[PDB]
Design a protein that fits this description.
Strand content: 15-25%
Distance between the termini: 19 Å
Keywords: 4Fe-4S, Iron, Iron-sulfur, Lyase, Metal-binding, Nitrogen fixation, S-adenosyl-L-methionine
Family: Belongs to the radical SAM superfamily. NifB family.
Order of helices and strands: HHEEHEHEHEHEEHEHEH
Binding site for [4Fe-4S] cluster 1: 10, 23, 46, 109
Number of domains: 1
Radius of gyration: 17 Å
Cofactor: [4Fe-4S] cluster
CATH class: Alpha Beta
Strand order of the largest sheet: 1-3-4-5-8-9
Shape: globular
Bound molecules: iron/sulfur cluster, chloride ion
CATH topology: TIM Barrel
CATH architecture: Alpha-Beta Barrel
Domain Radical SAM core: 16-252
Helix content: 25-40%
Length: 252
């Protein structure tokens, strides 16, 4: 195959060399704190590091779509991926509702840390989102606890193992529900040497059974509490990716 994969640069190798995507930075708030993230910068799960985007209101974001779709025609996808957690900001839903209603041809895409995916998947479906990226760095909460300072869920900040268990249970429930609703799911995993760099095999097996379409293993960008960790070398990353390809399709 369907068009939401074939023409999405992040879900098809062929589409990456042919079609473009644009991000609308309408979602400044975040609801967790990753130990590799400095909040000054656009969510590094779905952005190159060290970037500071101007935050747009839904109306301004629609205006940027208008102008981009005028100067360029290769644009197939419009997404919200930052600067914080898209599902933690009502402006995400207002923006994609405006874009989808005016430009039904565009593929609507979102990235999420997954915490609010169970609570908001019904909204995403109703507004026409067909592609969802979830960043899943652990399927064992004792490993998750090593990756997150805290999560904010339903008006309470949690730390430690409790926070990790709340996050993981919601990520899995949300992915399951997204798959049930025939959404195309991509899972990002930040490869963190010494923390989840062999656990990623367990992640791949789990998301494969759950119906995730593609897996994107990203090398750690050392920052914040992980600033001292030596990132995986390129050849180290390709070796893991090559092995994980026998479990689930890898984004290359
Ligand atoms: S999800 Fe993590 S990396 Fe992304 S903005 Fe929130 S704390 Fe930073
Ligand atoms: S949110 Fe992620 S998958 Fe969607 S267009 Fe942006 S980079 Fe690609
Ligand atoms: Cl389609």
């Amino acid at each position: 195959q369907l068009r939401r994969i074939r023409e999405h640069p992040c879900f098809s190798e062929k589409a990456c060399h042919a079609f473009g995507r644009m991000h609308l930075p309408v979602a400044p708030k975040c609801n967790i704190q990753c130990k590799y993230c400095i909040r000054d910068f656009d969510c590094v799960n779905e952005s190159r590091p060290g970037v500071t985007s101007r935050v747009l209101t839904p109306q301004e974001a629609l205006e940027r779509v208008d102008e981009v779709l005028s100067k360029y025609h290769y644009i197939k996808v419009v997404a919200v991926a930052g600067p914080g957690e898209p599902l933690a900001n009502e402006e995400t839903f207002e923006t994609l509702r405006l874009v989808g209603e005016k430009y039904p041809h565009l593929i609507l895409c979102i990235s999420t840390n997954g915490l609010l995916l169970p609570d908001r998947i019904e909204d995403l479906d109703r507004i026409g989102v067909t592609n969802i990226t979830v960043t899943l760095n652990a399927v064992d909460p004792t490993i998750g606890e090593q990756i997150y300072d805290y999560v904010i869920y339903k008006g309470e900040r949690y730390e430690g193992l409790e926070a990790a268990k709340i996050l993981l249970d919601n990520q899995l429930k949300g992915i399951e529900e997204a798959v049930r609703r025939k959404k195309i799911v991509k899972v990002n995993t930040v490869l963190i040497p010494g923390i989840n760099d062999k656990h990623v095999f367990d992640i791949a097996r789990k998301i494969k059974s759950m119906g995730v379409f593609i897996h994107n293993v990203m090398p750690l960008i050392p920052q914040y509490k992980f600033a001292h960790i030596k990132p995986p070398t390129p050849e180290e990353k390709r070796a893991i990716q090559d092995e994980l390809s026998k479990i689930i399709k890898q984004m290359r």
